[PDB]
Amino acid sequence: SSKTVTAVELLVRQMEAEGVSYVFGIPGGPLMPLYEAIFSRKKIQPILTKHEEGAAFMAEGYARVSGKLGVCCATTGPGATNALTGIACAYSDSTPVLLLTAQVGTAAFGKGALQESTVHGVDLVSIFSPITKLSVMIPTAEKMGEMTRRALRTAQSGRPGPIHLNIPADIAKHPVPLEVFPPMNYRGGKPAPTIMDVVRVAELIFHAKRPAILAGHGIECAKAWEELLDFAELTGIPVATTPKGKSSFPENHALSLGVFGFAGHQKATDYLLSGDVDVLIVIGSSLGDWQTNSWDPRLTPSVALIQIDIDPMEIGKNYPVDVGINADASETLKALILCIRSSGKGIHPAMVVEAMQNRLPADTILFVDNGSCINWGVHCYLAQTPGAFQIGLGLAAMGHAVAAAIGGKLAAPDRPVVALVGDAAFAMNGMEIHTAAEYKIPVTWIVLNNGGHGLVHLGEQHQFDSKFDISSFRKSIDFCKMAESLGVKSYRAETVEDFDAALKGALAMNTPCLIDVQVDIDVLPPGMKQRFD
Amino acid sequence: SSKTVTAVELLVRQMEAEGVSYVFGIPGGPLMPLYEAIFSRKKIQPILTKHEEGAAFMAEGYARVSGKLGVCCATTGPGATNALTGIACAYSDSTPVLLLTAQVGTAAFGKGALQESTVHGVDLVSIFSPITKLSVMIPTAEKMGEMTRRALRTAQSGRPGPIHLNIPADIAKHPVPLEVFPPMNYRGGKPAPTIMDVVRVAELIFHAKRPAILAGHGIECAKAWEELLDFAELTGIPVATTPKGKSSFPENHALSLGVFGFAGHQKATDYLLSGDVDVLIVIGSSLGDWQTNSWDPRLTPSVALIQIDIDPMEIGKNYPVDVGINADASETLKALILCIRSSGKGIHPAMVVEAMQNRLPADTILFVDNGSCINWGVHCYLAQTPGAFQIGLGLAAMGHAVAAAIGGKLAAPDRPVVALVGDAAFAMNGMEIHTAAEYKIPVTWIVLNNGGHGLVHLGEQHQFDSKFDISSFRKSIDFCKMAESLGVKSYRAETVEDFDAALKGALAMNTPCLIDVQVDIDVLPPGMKQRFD
Ligand SMILES: Nc1ncnc2c1ncn2[C@@H]1O[C@H](COP(=O)(O)OP(=O)(O)O)[C@@H](O)[C@H]1O
Ligand SMILES: Nc1ncnc2c1ncn2[C@@H]1O[C@H](COP(=O)(O)OP(=O)(O)O)[C@@H](O)[C@H]1O
Ligand SMILES: Cc1ncc(C[n+]2csc(CCOP(=O)(O)OP(=O)(O)O)c2C)c(N)n1
Ligand SMILES: Cc1ncc(C[n+]2csc(CCOP(=O)(O)OP(=O)(O)O)c2C)c(N)n1
Ligand SMILES: [Mg+2]
């Protein structure tokens, strides 16, 4: 006969215990009980977005920067389906995002309820099943606690990923016992390497004449920046990153090879494909297409390929491994450090990036969209701070960075947050700067305004002999005016001097800002030629 | 040894035979062979949109207005997932929309390909399965013709609905035999009622003292407007429509009851729930929540319920039927006519709508979005022309009408096309007005700008005691400035006199136009109080 709360309040309180601070989303009729519970608790802050997709991107960005669980909510039917791309990006980047969706009342199942979201209508649980680690409808109020804890355990254990919890509106306000647990009670710790593997890796490094490390996005998921650095310095092993793993290692460090793979650096290409690397250590990379120059066989080391991954299904997928370590990257690096120590043995886009480099403070978190910004950002921007380069290459969704940067700023309010994005990507999700204006979230968007789809335009020229154009706008979008309409200060930049001033002004603001940069659509970005050939 | 074409060209030619005139979408690397084929044939025209969701909405609007198949295309991964909401609305409204998605080349399956869209990545085929009649990956170039015909047959047969065809990029340019068929060779006709059921309905009508017809959106799917009108006039039976079925029967006609159900008219409510209707004929309605005032038992007739539906699974779902006719609505009505004849026996939103009624030509196609616009359009606008009221109430996705109106105008270029939409819905998909500017598509958007989520705000007041606000913008969006930024002429209207002038100007343009109307968020729309109780 214990203390009761509503099922949806229990859910909110259990999220509190996980350190959730924001819920991104858009309300709707069957979702209102969740908002009622949030506003009654006055701890988690709801963020109203313009599109549920932007809500999901924001939760994804909040999660990646905070290292915590991101949470978004959407209503029945088209609310939840609008979130899908963002959940699919969290899925492809191994980001823990919880999507809470509403469901009609049980008494209306199979009758043609408004936005019915069951097997009889638009089956949200089945739609999200392929791109979540778990997609389930809460069957009864009594199971809310167990299912919530299950979702939280599943999102953040093993390879992190998103969760979809669907909540019938009548279940939401049923009374349940107030049963909230600390996170350590309902999820376990991280896997470590075996003693044998540590000793074998140590020995391989001791005898290696040209070892190398390829560090991927798993370094960020494992929060292993300081261990990777210590390990690299203790051994003298040079470190390349994958494109998405950029900022896992300080690119100004003497041991940094830069980025290997798409839009990468000749320094890394020469070191890793020259045939001289005898021991290659892959840490937290899935070794997909862009990470390997389309599975280039020259990546194969001459003595041993060591691959460290928390997901056992990634080990040896595309390259045969000699030491396949199923463990968390941070636990592995710590063990390796323990073993080795104890032993004792328009404007040219490049100018834009350069100008950004000269003005952005060192602690800036840089979000980069998908488009030619990828090449310019990955290739030309020097990332010195751990985790400060945020790019969603798993799915490479246009508009991801446009919205994710807002969630990032909420996760790191003390740090400058800048997003480098294309104009077509900004047309997809740029309305979200209104969300930044509404909540006074200071982010700076730099729009490479080349009047259309640059990467597609170059593909038409280089692969289809300019036979057709389905990439250039007849009239460019005026982002300054668009920003103005959404209540966000803006600057237009047609020269480097103009850009430098704009950036300078933007950084000093305590509100959001947009910089519309004039850029030529014909400019060939770094690495695209090789990619075309 | 007969002529061969590429698989993707075969697909384009087979869509030509179905009368497809536009393909809405956004290009991407694996999708480019489709665009190459389209541009080489110069009959189907590609329409570049701002978001793949807007492309799916446009295909949906094109399909509903044209009575033909709508086609949208998206690239791998996030391109396709961005379309999902629009496809889900086609599914909920029984609209034939074909979504063509690209897939990576087969040689990269399971290796971590860029935007890999297989079971090993983001599994598009399984994601779309719940909201399509068919979702399949073309396994070989040789099967392109059969799979295409299968898709076209499936979309437009039985209860119409959307299809997802996923095309591996390497298959796209393999040679295949040039084999194109007219639609009648690979899909059949419509089913008719049995003579026994026709005679039974005729007898029930001949003896009925207070008959009524409730006509739904199936009337449009069957293109049965003239047969419905002739049937009602022949029998003297008054006709109500469902909300979504509005414009299936001329609302100025002496036999019109108006709309029954959500935001409907008292005339229809009095007639149908009085208990005096003895024979009720439901034609092409799924009898969901809004169609039945939450399955009101008083809708039950006292003698006989007759239900006509092409989908046998809808017949008798929520109300027991006495005559359940599985047939096309147009074939059934023609049969009934043949039998009976042979026998021989801010600004207040209501003022906005009145001004629209006071200027719009009779042939105007009115798209109404989802939001309080539903209530104002359904209740206050008098629809006289068959099919000229276009509302997507199956899923009621915000932003649907914003984009669907562009496809509608392309389907009926000689007719005025106007969209009545809320400001939050325009923030979700309003960027598509740049698509209308790019192609010079004259559509008029009327934005009810109440500075936030009107229906949600009223729900907070009437169901949650104004305890919280997650609905009002701190600073409303300036849609005239946004339109200007996107190259679209615009007007701001704060009085009915300004609005009338704006509409007049808008109708005379041969370019798109946006009208930003000041509206009080507090006004209670017709039918809301009833829904609240
Ligand atoms: N905590 C962790 N420790 C080690 N590996 C991890 C951890 N979290 C995620 N991973 C792994 O890191 C990899 C990330 O791959 P991906 O997201 O494709 O980035 P990249 O583009 O750098 O390969 C996955 O193979 C995943 O299993
Ligand atoms: N050609 C047709 N003839 C008869 N009924 C049809 C036809 N096409 C679709 N239908 C039916 O019309 C109904 C449409 O229901 P719905 O889209 O919910 O509209 P409404 O809101 O008017 O009920 C479905 O039950 C579908 O099976
Ligand atoms: C949602 C989505 N649709 C399509 C693509 C395919 N795509 C990759 S780059 C590109 C063009 C991006 O244009 P813009 O953002 O203006 O950048 P630019 O390359 O011109 O700098 C497109 C459509 C994608 N990645 N995501
Ligand atoms: C994609 C989507 N998200 C959420 C909802 C829930 N919803 C119904 S009405 C409404 C408010 C719409 O606001 P606006 O378009 O400005 O219209 P208003 O009611 O203020 O006229 C919302 C969010 C929805 N129907 N579709
Ligand atoms: Mg561009």
Ligand SMILES: [Mg+2]
């Ligand atoms: Mg509104």
